[PDB]
């Protein structure tokens, strides 16, 4: 499968999540995603084909994971935006007030700005600390998906937020959305990964 940020993957033929970013670890290909999406050794599939298994994760506390993929997958330095692409150029962290977009299998590519850093989410499973908050909208299934600036700086992966009864927060004004992402920096160093860029 071609690995692009934002696309759908299923875990152990049940849950769906979105791919974060194509990365490598030595000769191993992989992608970073959300920790809540699967447990170590869960099987990830893209379009019905097996592409890899979860190598590691942290959830709750943090919300991160990386899947190592088989040799046959194609890693790409891109994030889906409809039928087009955002090229990944690095991982400089943007500050509060910067514009940012996120891509994921449920609401597609949505943009907005960062409103706060170091936010704690109280999930049913336990607190997730250190999250960055944006007001781009998102829905169930977007988790693990890419957060990136128009300029190509990867910011993190979708963790969660406040969804209404329709499964997303896109029908509530930007001023009321809380959309939370796990910063990418610490996931790259924690796992020794390198981002693929173009």
């Amino acid at each position: 499968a071609n690995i692009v940020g934002g696309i759908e993957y299923s875990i152990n033929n049940a849950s769906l999540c979105s791919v974060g970013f194509s990365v490598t670890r030595g000769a191993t290909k992989g992608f970073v995603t959300a920790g809540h999406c699967g447990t170590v050794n869960a099987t990830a599939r893209i379009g019905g084909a097996v592409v890899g298994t979860f190598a590691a994760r942290v959830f709750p506390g943090n919300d991160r994971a990386w899947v190592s993929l088989t040799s046959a997958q194609t890693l790409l330095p891109r994030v889906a935006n409809g039928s087009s692409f955002v090229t990944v150029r690095g991982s400089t962290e943007a500050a509060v007030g910067a514009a940012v977009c996120r891509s994921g299998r449920t609401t597609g590519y949505q943009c907005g700005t960062i409103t706060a850093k170091n936010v704690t989410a109280n999930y049913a499973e336990g607190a997730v600390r250190g999250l960055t908050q944006g007001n781009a909208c998102m829905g169930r299934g977007d988790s693990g998906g890419s957060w990136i600036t128009s300029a190509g700086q990867a910011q993190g992966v979708m963790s969660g937020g406040n969804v209404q009864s329709n499964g997303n927060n896109c029908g509530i004004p930007a001023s009321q959305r809380s959309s939370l992402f796990e910063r990418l920096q610490p996931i790259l160093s924690q796992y020794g990964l390198s981002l693929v860029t173009g």
Binding site: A121, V128, M138, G161
Partner: peptide, 4 residues
């Protein structure tokens, strides 16, 4: 808040 919910994960996703």
């Amino acid at each position: 808040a919910a994960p996703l």
